[PDB]
Amino acid sequence: SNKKMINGGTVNNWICINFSRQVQDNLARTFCQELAQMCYVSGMAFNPEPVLPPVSARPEQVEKVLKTRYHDATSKLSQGKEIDLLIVILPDNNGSLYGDLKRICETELGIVSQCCLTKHVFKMSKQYMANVALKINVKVGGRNTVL
Ligand SMILES: O=c1ccn([C@@H]2O[C@H](COP(=O)(O)O)[C@@H](O)[C@H]2O)c(=O)[nH]1
């Protein structure tokens, strides 16, 4: 047995921010679509469309991009609803960007986030997608089997 979902969580509203200069908008979009579809067939409720299209940003503007995109996406939502998930595409070698992302998400925005490295975006393997679905599920309050 590989791990599976016991209870799938719910991602009704999500957005993607991209920090990789090797990744054009359409690829981030296609990536997120494949990931969304994996989470769904694995047992989640998962909106096949994001609240807003992916945006591309420089690592240097992590604070500004995250806060602004959070604000703009949340504002688009029916009053009282919140963003369930941020998918972030990172350069493979991103230095302090991961840790800065996570501090902002955890302690300022209080948003669930899932980072994905450029190398996996390019490969978009089903095994990778399945693993990341599992991580997401736990993060949004689902439950997975144990080995
Ligand atoms: O200091 C770190 C820690 C993790 N990663 C990457 O982020 C991913 C997972 O992100 P997340 O599940 O913590 O959101 C990985 O596949 C991992 O290699 C980094 O780029 N920097």
Curated annotation (Swiss-Prot):
Family the UniProt entry places it in: Belongs to the argonaute family. Ago subfamily.
The name this protein goes by in its record: Protein argonaute 1
Record text on subunit structure and interactions: Interacts with turnip yellows virus (TuYV) protein P0 (via F-box-like domain); this interaction targets AGO1 for degradation, and thereby suppresses its function in silencing. Interacts with turnip crinkle virus (TCV) capsid protein P38 (via GW motifs); these interactions inhibit RNA silencing ability of AGO1. Interacts (via PAZ domain) with cucumber mosaic virus (CMV) protein 2b; these interactions inhibit AGO1 function in RNA silencing. Interacts with SDE3. Interacts with HESO1. Interacts with URT1. Interacts with RICE1 and RICE2 that act as cofactors.
Function in brief: Involved in RNA-mediated post-transcriptional gene silencing (PTGS). Main component of the RNA-induced silencing complex (RISC) that binds to a short guide RNA such as microRNA (miRNA) or small interfering RNA (siRNA). RISC uses the mature miRNA or siRNA as a guide for slicer-directed cleavage of homologous mRNAs to repress gene expression. Requires DRB1 for directional loading of the small RNA duplex (guide stand and passenger strand) onto RISC for passenger strand degradation.
Cell location: Cytoplasm
Knockout consequences: Narrow rosette leaves. Single shoot bearing a terminal inflorescence. Abnormal inflorescence with infertile flowers and filamentous organs.
Tissue specificity annotation: Widely expressed at low levels.
